């Protein structure tokens, strides 16, 4: 009837062509205006096997996002291996916009509709479609912002939870807003305000999910063990500015503990800094940008997922320890591409 296969995809968007925003300028020539009448066909009485971790659409996307960033964001100075490139760095307006992908003739996308499907294995409620859902090309570390939510339960996805070296994606069914701000008039200092109560509630629910998946052992959350900031802190781009955010307070193991009413449950404020000297995620190298613009800078974003790495190693104890994930952004893309798989019919 059909055979799973990979191929070249074509993107669709709806960005206005008159806008100066970089995502819109890129999409207006990279993507086709959105289908106003999209259709999805429920496939009756078929169970299909999926593997979110080996699925070419994430690779193609990653290529599209790297092309977008290379074309749009222009650093003052770039350092590649034995290469220095000097180029003007004009200030730009930056805001992720959602985009779809679509297959040409002969190829369709199967989408799993099971509520608790974990990115791999069999799925019973499967449909077919020509185009994906809106996806915002957001780049983030340890946290998955402005994404889609889980439907029934907080879902733990991994190529293999048993392996300590495989990143773990956590899909939330209730987003948490994070409000980061650089006040107008130390121009790099900034902060992010997170509601403590919801944060700790979803944190305890996630902890219980991990306990269920891991023989009810004692779950510990700790800050990262080391690395460059892009991972030891929380990296993102907002209004063209590169924010690194200290998330030490977000893994407080006592606020979920049974210490009754304590200093938790308040609005937790974590420090952040804008840095011009960053390590490019597109490729190895460094990038120096212009200093941040004047005036209020703000971004309110819905944390929808969590990136984690487990320590592991000669456990034989009461506890499993976890630390925030990040690094490879193909996993960030997989976090939303887990539902889709391309298939040939001819």
């Amino acid at each position, epitope marked *: 009837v059909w055979k799973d296969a990979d191929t070249t995809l074509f993107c669709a968007s709806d960005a206005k062509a008159h806008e100066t925003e970089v995502h819109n300028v890129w999409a207006t020539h990279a993507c086709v205006p959105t289908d106003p009448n999209p259709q999805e066909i429920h496939l009756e009485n078929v169970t299909e096997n999926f593997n979110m971790w080996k699925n070419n659409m994430v690779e193609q996307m990653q290529e599209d996002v790297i092309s977008l960033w290379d074309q749009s964001l222009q650093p003052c100075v770039k350092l590649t291996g034995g290469s220095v490139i000097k180029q003007a760095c004009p200030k730009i307006s930056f805001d992720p916009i959602p985009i779809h992908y679509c297959t040409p003739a002969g190829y369709v996308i199967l989408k799993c509709n099971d509520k608790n499907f974990n990115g791999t294995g069999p799925c019973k409620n499967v449909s077919s479609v020509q185009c994906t859902h809106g996806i915002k090309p957001v780049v983030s570390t340890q946290l998955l912002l402005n994404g889609s939510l889980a439907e029934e339960e907080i879902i733990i996805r991994s190529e293999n939870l*048993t*392996n*300590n*070296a495989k990143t773990i994606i956590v899909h939330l069914n209730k987003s948490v807003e994070i409000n980061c701000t650089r006040p107008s008039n130390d121009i790099r200092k900034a902060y992010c305000e997170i509601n403590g109560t919801k944060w700790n509630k979803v944190l305890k629910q996630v902890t219980e999910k991990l306990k269920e998946h891991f023989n009810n052992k004692t779950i510990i959350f700790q800050p990262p*063990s080391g690395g460059d900031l892009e991972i*030891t802190m929380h990296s993102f781009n907002c209004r063209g500015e590169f924010f690194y955010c200290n998330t030490t307070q977000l893994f407080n193991n006592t606020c979920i503990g049974n210490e009754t009413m304590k200093g938790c449950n308040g609005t937790i404020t974590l420090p952040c800094k804008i840095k011009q000297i960053i*390590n490019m995620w597109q490729g190895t190298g460094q990038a120096m940008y212009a200093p941040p613009i004047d005036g209020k800078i703000n971004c309110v974003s819905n944390i929808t997922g969590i990136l984690l790495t487990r320590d*592991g*190693g*000669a456990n034989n104890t009461s506890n499993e320890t976890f630390r925030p994930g990040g690094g490879n952004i193909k996993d960030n893309w997989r976090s939303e591409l887990y539902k889709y798989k391309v298939v040939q019919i001819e």
Partner: antibody, heavy 120, light 98 residues
Framework: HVQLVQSGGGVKKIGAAVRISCEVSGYNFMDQFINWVRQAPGQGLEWMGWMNPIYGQVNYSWRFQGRVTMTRDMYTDTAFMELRGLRVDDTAVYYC?????????????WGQGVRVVVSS | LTQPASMSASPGQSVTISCSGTRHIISAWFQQYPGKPPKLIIFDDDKRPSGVPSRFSASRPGDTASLTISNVQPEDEATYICNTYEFFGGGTKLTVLS
């Protein structure tokens, strides 16, 4: 022809610290993790941690976190491991290792091992 | 894990070393000549790389992964270790019986 060697061992005092560097050749350093494993004299193997050289993703064992720090240098294609605060039991032979293309485990490739003698 | 420390078998016969406690997570097998870095000789339960002979075989039907060696030879005097991710066995030092 995957080649990879160690050049950092020796004989050290009590406590102090030691540095071990493991160079590779035959593939792009950015791909594939590196793992550190210690062999006590006449005793089984013990895994201490691993590193992803892309940004510096490190993962440590509970027995060693807070003691050892793993570092990297992309341009010279060399991984490093520093064992700050070593005792007598740390007298061992140290291995840097990697696995097949794509995935980390198991450890198909082992360097050469280097001696570390924790002295008085 | 669960591994014998030292077996023995005369040249020509067959020997089996089983590592238990794998928790049902694949299996790897390493041969170590004391003094030098080890060398894996099989991977993924029932497959082996090049450079080694068909004298070696293995099977992981569950909690115990067994490794069989026929026609003992003088370089078969080695320590054999079971592997599961970052886990290694106590190693079995098998030697000749001259």
């Amino acid at each position: 022809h995957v080649q990879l060697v160690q050049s950092g061992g020796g004989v050290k005092k009590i406590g102090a610290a030691v540095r071990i560097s493991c160079e590779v050749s035959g593939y792009n350093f950015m791909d594939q993790f590196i793992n550190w494993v210690r062999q006590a004299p006449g005793q089984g193997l013990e895994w201490m941690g691993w590193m992803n050289p892309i940004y510096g993703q490190v993962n440590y064992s509970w027995r060693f976190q807070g003691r050892v720090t793993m570092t990297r240098d992309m341009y010279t294609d060399t991984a490093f491991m520093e064992l700050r605060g070593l005792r007598v039991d740390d007298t061992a032979v140290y291995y840097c290792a990697r696995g097949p293309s794509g995935e980390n485990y198991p450890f198909h490739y082992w360097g050469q091992g280097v001696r570390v003698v924790v002295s008085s | 894990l669960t591994q014998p420390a030292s077996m023995s078998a005369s040249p020509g016969q067959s020997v089996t070393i089983s590592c238990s406690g794998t928790r049902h997570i694949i299996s790897a097998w390493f041969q170590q000549y004391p003094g030098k870095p080890p060398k894996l000789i099989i991977f993924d339960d029932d497959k082996r790389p090049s450079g080694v002979p068909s004298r070696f075989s293995a099977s992981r039907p569950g909690d115990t992964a067994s490794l069989t060696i026929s026609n003992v030879q003088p370089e078969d005097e080695a320590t054999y270790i079971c592997n599961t991710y970052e886990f290694f066995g106590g190693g079995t030092k098998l030697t000749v019986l001259s």
